[PDB]
Amino acid sequence: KGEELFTGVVPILVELDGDVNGHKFSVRGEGEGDATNGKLTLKFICTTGKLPVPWPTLVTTLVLCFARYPDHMKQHDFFKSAMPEGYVQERTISFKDDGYYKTRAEVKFEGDTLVNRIELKGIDFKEDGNILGHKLEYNSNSHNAYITADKQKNGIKSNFKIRHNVEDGSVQLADHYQQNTPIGDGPVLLPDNHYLSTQNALSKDPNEKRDHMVLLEFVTAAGIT
């Protein structure tokens, strides 16, 4: 059905418009995803110049249909079931002792390309803080996030903690509250409790003067015995 669209390598486009404390910005990303391996590789550009927040605080915002579900769990893969009609992904990301992001995204096929189109708004940040002040390291910790279904919306939900390394050695916590609901009316799989296992590698492109992030990410589903 839908997962049949992720059998090979799939090109990806990501487009974000953001506004954090009135600091506006745009990011564009392109690359590809290999769901059989659970692998994503993309290069992101801040097309409006200087990104006013640290690149790692946007990783979770900038395509969970490329996660690797083990065959004994193919019946718990909500994200692929809704394709190619896609789903809406919405989050609140509350940074501890600081502001919060609100995101609304549509992930769906436009032709052969998987597209992630996001609107982000950031509210109540401290201009001298860890985010607006660029005090976070350029790295990304591995993390697990538990998925549960929500039948009262025909989708899934997940709360999970992200921990950003601060350059003083402390840790900045970012609480994520997520919901996903399908765009079409077709049948979608509603899973049982499980989790996604994620690793991220962040790097730079040597011949790129623009503000940018090269990202390699692996996402693998687990939890169902």
Short mmCIF file of C-alpha atoms in Angstrom, two decimals:
data_model
loop_
_atom_site.label_atom_id
_atom_site.label_comp_id
_atom_site.label_asym_id
_atom_site.label_seq_id
_atom_site.Cartn_x
_atom_site.Cartn_y
_atom_site.Cartn_z
CA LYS A 1 0.00 0.00 0.00
CA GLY A 2 1.69 3.15 1.39
CA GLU A 3 4.88 1.56 2.80
CA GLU A 4 5.39 0.27 -0.75
CA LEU A 5 6.44 3.86 -1.51
CA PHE A 6 9.46 3.59 0.86
CA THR A 7 11.00 0.44 -0.63
CA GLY A 8 13.84 2.32 -2.35
CA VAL A 9 15.63 5.65 -1.88
CA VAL A 10 13.21 8.59 -1.75
CA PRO A 11 14.19 12.23 -2.40
CA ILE A 12 13.24 14.72 0.34
CA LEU A 13 12.50 18.44 0.48
CA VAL A 14 12.13 20.39 3.73
CA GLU A 15 10.91 24.00 3.88
CA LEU A 16 10.52 25.95 7.12
CA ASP A 17 9.34 29.49 7.86
CA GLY A 18 10.09 30.51 11.43
CA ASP A 19 9.56 33.47 13.75
CA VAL A 20 11.12 33.44 17.24
CA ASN A 21 10.56 36.61 19.32
CA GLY A 22 10.01 38.42 16.02
CA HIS A 23 13.32 37.17 14.62
CA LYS A 24 12.13 35.71 11.31
CA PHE A 25 14.02 33.13 9.23
CA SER A 26 13.63 30.47 6.56
CA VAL A 27 15.37 27.10 6.13
CA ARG A 28 15.43 24.87 3.05
CA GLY A 29 16.72 21.29 3.04
CA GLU A 30 17.19 18.64 0.39
CA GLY A 31 18.49 15.08 0.37
CA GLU A 32 17.10 11.57 0.61
CA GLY A 33 15.73 8.87 2.86
CA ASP A 34 16.22 5.10 2.91
CA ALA A 35 13.50 3.68 5.16
CA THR A 36 14.62 0.05 4.79
CA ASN A 37 17.75 1.11 6.67
CA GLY A 38 16.08 3.92 8.65
CA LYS A 39 18.57 6.44 7.24
CA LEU A 40 18.13 10.12 6.34
CA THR A 41 20.82 12.40 4.89
CA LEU A 42 20.09 16.07 4.24
CA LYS A 43 21.78 19.44 3.92
CA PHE A 44 19.88 22.42 5.35
CA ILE A 45 20.47 26.07 4.42
CA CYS A 46 19.26 29.17 6.22
CA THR A 47 18.14 31.01 3.11
CA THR A 48 17.53 34.30 5.01
CA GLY A 49 21.13 34.59 6.24
CA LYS A 50 22.00 33.97 9.90
CA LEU A 51 19.85 31.44 11.75
CA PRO A 52 18.68 33.16 14.97
CA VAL A 53 18.49 29.90 16.99
CA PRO A 54 20.97 27.00 17.28
CA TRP A 55 20.74 24.38 14.53
CA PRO A 56 20.25 21.48 17.00
CA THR A 57 17.06 22.98 18.42
CA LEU A 58 15.43 22.47 15.00
CA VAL A 59 16.46 18.82 14.36
CA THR A 60 13.20 17.30 15.64
CA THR A 61 11.21 19.87 13.59
CA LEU A 62 13.09 19.49 10.27
CA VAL A 63 9.92 12.90 8.53
CA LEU A 64 9.18 9.86 10.69
CA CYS A 65 7.88 7.93 7.69
CA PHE A 66 11.55 7.00 7.05
CA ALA A 67 11.91 5.16 10.37
CA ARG A 68 12.75 1.46 10.15
CA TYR A 69 9.93 -0.63 11.50
CA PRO A 70 10.96 -4.29 11.99
CA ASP A 71 8.73 -6.70 10.06
CA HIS A 72 7.27 -8.04 13.28
CA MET A 73 6.07 -4.41 13.81
CA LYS A 74 4.96 -3.35 10.29
CA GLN A 75 1.39 -3.18 11.68
CA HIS A 76 2.38 -0.35 14.06
CA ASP A 77 3.75 2.02 11.39
CA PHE A 78 1.25 4.88 11.44
CA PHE A 79 3.43 7.31 9.46
CA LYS A 80 3.78 5.17 6.32
CA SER A 81 0.13 4.07 6.35
CA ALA A 82 -1.11 7.63 5.71
CA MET A 83 0.97 8.06 2.56
CA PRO A 84 0.93 9.42 -0.09
CA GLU A 85 -1.79 11.66 1.40
CA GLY A 86 0.51 12.44 4.33
CA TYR A 87 -0.18 13.62 7.84
CA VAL A 88 -0.05 16.76 9.95
CA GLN A 89 2.60 16.93 12.67
CA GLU A 90 2.15 19.47 15.46
CA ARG A 91 4.34 20.11 18.47
CA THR A 92 4.98 22.31 21.42
CA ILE A 93 8.63 22.34 22.38
CA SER A 94 8.97 23.92 25.82
CA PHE A 95 12.54 24.82 26.73
CA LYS A 96 13.17 24.64 30.47
CA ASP A 97 13.49 28.16 31.96
CA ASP A 98 13.03 29.82 28.56
CA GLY A 99 10.63 30.14 25.62
CA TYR A 100 8.67 27.58 23.64
CA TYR A 101 8.29 26.63 19.97
CA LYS A 102 4.97 25.88 18.29
CA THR A 103 5.19 23.95 15.03
CA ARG A 104 2.71 22.84 12.42
CA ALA A 105 3.91 20.69 9.54
CA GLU A 106 2.50 18.75 6.61
CA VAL A 107 4.51 15.74 5.44
CA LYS A 108 3.21 14.24 2.19
CA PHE A 109 4.19 13.28 -1.33
CA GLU A 110 4.34 15.87 -4.10
CA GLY A 111 5.23 13.75 -7.08
CA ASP A 112 8.08 11.38 -6.23
CA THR A 113 9.43 13.72 -3.52
CA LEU A 114 8.60 13.48 0.18
CA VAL A 115 8.00 17.06 1.39
CA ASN A 116 8.08 18.44 4.96
CA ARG A 117 6.59 21.96 5.07
CA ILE A 118 6.69 23.57 8.50
CA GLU A 119 5.48 26.74 10.16
CA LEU A 120 7.30 27.49 13.42
CA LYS A 121 6.62 30.25 15.94
CA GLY A 122 8.80 30.86 19.02
CA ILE A 123 7.36 32.69 22.03
CA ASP A 124 8.77 34.15 25.26
CA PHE A 125 12.47 33.43 24.79
CA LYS A 126 15.18 35.23 26.73
CA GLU A 127 17.37 37.27 24.39
CA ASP A 128 20.38 36.50 26.63
CA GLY A 129 19.43 32.81 27.06
CA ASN A 130 20.77 29.52 25.70
CA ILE A 131 18.72 29.59 22.49
CA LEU A 132 18.68 33.22 21.35
CA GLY A 133 22.23 33.59 22.77
CA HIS A 134 23.69 30.64 20.80
CA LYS A 135 25.10 28.82 23.84
CA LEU A 136 24.40 25.22 22.74
CA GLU A 137 26.94 22.80 21.37
CA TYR A 138 26.72 21.68 17.74
CA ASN A 139 25.84 18.05 18.48
CA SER A 140 22.81 15.86 19.22
CA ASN A 141 22.29 13.14 21.84
CA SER A 142 20.69 9.81 21.07
CA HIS A 143 17.17 9.50 22.45
CA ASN A 144 14.12 7.24 22.63
CA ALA A 145 10.55 8.56 22.32
CA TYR A 146 7.47 6.52 23.22
CA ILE A 147 4.55 6.47 20.78
CA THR A 148 0.95 5.81 21.82
CA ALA A 149 -2.12 5.88 19.64
CA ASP A 150 -5.00 8.33 19.94
CA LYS A 151 -8.19 6.81 18.56
CA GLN A 152 -10.18 9.96 19.53
CA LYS A 153 -8.28 11.73 16.72
CA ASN A 154 -7.40 8.83 14.32
CA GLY A 155 -3.68 9.22 15.00
CA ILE A 156 -0.78 9.05 17.43
CA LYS A 157 0.71 11.18 20.17
CA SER A 158 4.03 11.25 21.97
CA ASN A 159 5.65 13.23 24.73
CA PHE A 160 9.42 12.96 25.01
CA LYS A 161 12.42 14.83 26.39
CA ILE A 162 15.29 16.19 24.29
CA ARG A 163 18.49 17.20 26.09
CA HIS A 164 20.77 19.77 24.42
CA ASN A 165 24.37 20.06 25.61
CA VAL A 166 25.16 23.64 26.85
CA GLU A 167 28.67 24.96 26.26
CA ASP A 168 29.26 25.44 30.01
CA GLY A 169 28.70 21.69 30.55
CA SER A 170 25.08 21.89 31.72
CA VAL A 171 22.10 20.44 29.87
CA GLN A 172 19.13 22.34 28.43
CA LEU A 173 15.91 20.31 28.47
CA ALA A 174 13.36 20.63 25.66
CA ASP A 175 10.01 18.99 26.39
CA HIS A 176 8.24 17.86 23.23
CA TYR A 177 4.50 17.29 22.99
CA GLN A 178 3.52 15.88 19.63
CA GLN A 179 0.38 14.91 17.76
CA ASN A 180 -0.10 13.48 14.29
CA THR A 181 -3.35 13.20 12.37
CA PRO A 182 -3.85 12.06 8.77
CA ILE A 183 -4.63 14.36 5.85
CA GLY A 184 -6.66 11.89 3.80
CA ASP A 185 -9.52 9.69 4.95
CA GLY A 186 -8.02 6.32 3.99
CA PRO A 187 -7.27 3.62 6.55
CA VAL A 188 -4.40 4.22 8.97
CA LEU A 189 -2.73 1.78 11.36
CA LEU A 190 -3.10 2.64 15.02
CA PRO A 191 -0.18 1.13 16.92
CA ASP A 192 0.32 -0.22 20.38
CA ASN A 193 2.68 1.42 22.86
CA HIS A 194 6.26 1.37 21.56
CA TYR A 195 9.11 3.78 20.92
CA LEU A 196 11.40 5.24 18.27
CA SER A 197 15.19 5.01 18.71
CA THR A 198 17.10 7.93 17.17
CA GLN A 199 20.74 8.82 16.52
CA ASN A 200 21.88 12.08 14.86
CA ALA A 201 25.21 13.15 13.37
CA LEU A 202 25.71 16.88 12.68
CA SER A 203 28.50 18.21 10.46
CA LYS A 204 29.46 21.04 8.08
CA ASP A 205 30.11 21.12 4.33
CA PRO A 206 33.63 22.47 3.65
CA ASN A 207 32.73 24.49 0.52
CA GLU A 208 29.56 26.16 1.89
CA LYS A 209 29.72 29.73 3.20
CA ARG A 210 26.03 29.98 4.04
CA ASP A 211 24.75 29.12 7.53
CA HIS A 212 23.87 25.44 7.25
CA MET A 213 23.65 21.97 8.79
CA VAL A 214 24.57 18.64 7.28
CA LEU A 215 22.53 15.94 9.03
CA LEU A 216 22.66 12.17 9.11
CA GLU A 217 19.91 10.56 11.22
CA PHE A 218 18.87 6.96 11.96
CA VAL A 219 15.37 6.19 13.32
CA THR A 220 14.46 2.60 14.29
CA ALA A 221 11.24 1.37 15.91
CA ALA A 222 11.28 -1.02 18.87
CA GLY A 223 9.40 -1.88 22.08
CA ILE A 224 6.96 -4.52 20.75
CA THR A 225 8.18 -7.86 22.15
#
